[PDB]
Amino acid sequence: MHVVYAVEEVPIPDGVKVAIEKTGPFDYVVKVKGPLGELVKEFKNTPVIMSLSDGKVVLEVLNAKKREYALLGTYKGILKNMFLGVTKGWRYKLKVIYTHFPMLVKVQGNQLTIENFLGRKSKIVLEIPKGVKVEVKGKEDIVVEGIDRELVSQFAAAIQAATELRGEEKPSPHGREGGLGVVDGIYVVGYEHVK
RNA sequence: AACGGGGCGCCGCGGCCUCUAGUGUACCGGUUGUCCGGCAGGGCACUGCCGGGCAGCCACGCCGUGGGGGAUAACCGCUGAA
Ligand SMILES: [Mg+2]
Ligand SMILES: [Mg+2]
Ligand SMILES: [Mg+2]
Ligand SMILES: [Mg+2]
Ligand SMILES: [Mg+2]
Predict the structure, then answer these.
(1) How many angstroms separate the CA of A117 from the C1' of B44?
(2) Which end of chain A is more exposed for a tag (fewer CB within 10 A), N or C?
(3) What is the number of alpha carbons within 13 Å of residue A164 lying toward its C-beta?
């Protein structure tokens, strides 16, 4: 379809300061300062016109096709996620599932390490990025907290994918005659806010 | 079974000659037949033949011969609207 003009509005919440700066012909840099910290995002080569209006961010498209009109909801969702990150934060939870070999997960510094995964002598080591806090709850839960939902979710995805094997090392998901197979690893169980 | 850790080959490539092996009509010795009168020394038998063998060359000998980064393929995921 074709759109002569479309507009969307994201209401800025209390205590959150938004700055929008034009760094190019169609580029934007957005800074969101909240109680929990600061978030910075870039929107490059975009048809969406972003502006500020008395506590709201206005997103506008003029003479847009479907591919340009779809960007309004995406930018709205990104801005809402940034606001919720600076206000309440983000906290992703992961579960540690083992069948015979317990997987010792530990956070030392900005390395997170998994030992004894399936009895492997090798140890999985992951570099925790800036602005992500990793905590190990008991022998079964992992918590990743931050103010960037994309960064926190990406790190949780990396943690889950570290325990998934590929190639010839991939074990059979199901057992003999249809039972459960060797399903061992760390599974992202969900998300919530810090506050 | 596997990841991970330790050890070593085979194939190829590039060098080297210390060792070992080959050659080595440089060199040294033994010996057959005949000629130089005999001994000695020697000619020829196309090194006469046999044994050893420096240097050099050489392999059948020795030495070196790697991890990493980037963008990616097949795809696997995060966020995410229409
Ligand atoms: Mg060679
Ligand atoms: Mg000889
Ligand atoms: Mg004589
Ligand atoms: Mg004569
Ligand atoms: Mg002769």
Answers:
(1) 90
(2) N
(3) 8
CA distance A48 to A95: 39
Report how far apart, in Å, the C-alpha atoms of A163 and of each of A120, A138, A180, A187 are.
11, 19, 17, 9
**Experimental resolution (Å):** 2.4
SS3 assignment, position A136: strand
With DSSP H G I counted as helix, E B as strand and the rest as coil, what are the percentages for chain A, rounded to 5?
Answer: 25, 45, 35
A8 φ, ψ (degrees, to nearest 5): -140, 155
Q: How far is the CA of A9 from the C1' of B70 (A)?
A: 40
Q: Which nucleotide is nearest to A167 (CA to C1')?
A: B2
User: Using what technique was this structure determined?
Assistant: cryo-EM
* Token couple for A88: 């309440």
**What's the Å distance between residue A126 CA and nucleotide B70 C1'?**
21
For chain A, the first-to-last Cα distance in angstroms comes to 42
Q: Is the CB of A69 under 7 A from strand B?
A: yes
